[PDB]
Symmetry: C4
Subunit: 39 residues, 4 copies
């Protein structure tokens, strides 16, 4: 039936997931930006 | 009730999020491609 | 008509996808944390 | 009204997006795995 709130409920989880990814690539863009060399 | 536009409204946010991720891994695929060495 | 379960069905796939990404950036945050140098 | 197909239509785009991310971190997990050093 009304699974429409169910979507909003797991998509809110997907956003929670990218909230990890985002910060982790932010972290990677920092590390990969050059941790021991490069500019 | 009609949360269906609400989904479209936060999924548009998820896409906004990967628009960061995408470009940031693009950045990582560039950096990790070899910033100070490698090919 | 009722594509609402269809969304939940492909969004469950998107979550399955980030379950790869998440762990892979976890992996990257580890590797990029310094595999041969850096801290 | 029925934005429900609209969701499926942009979520199909989000999946298209992670299809980039997934492969790009795959790429990063490869590069970050050690391109010039490490194991």
């Amino acid at each position: 039936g009304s699974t429409n709130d169910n979507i909003t409920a797991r998509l809110d989880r997907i956003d929670e997931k990218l909230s990890e990814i985002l910060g982790m690539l932010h972290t990677l863009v920092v590390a990969s930006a050059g941790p021991t060399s490069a500019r």
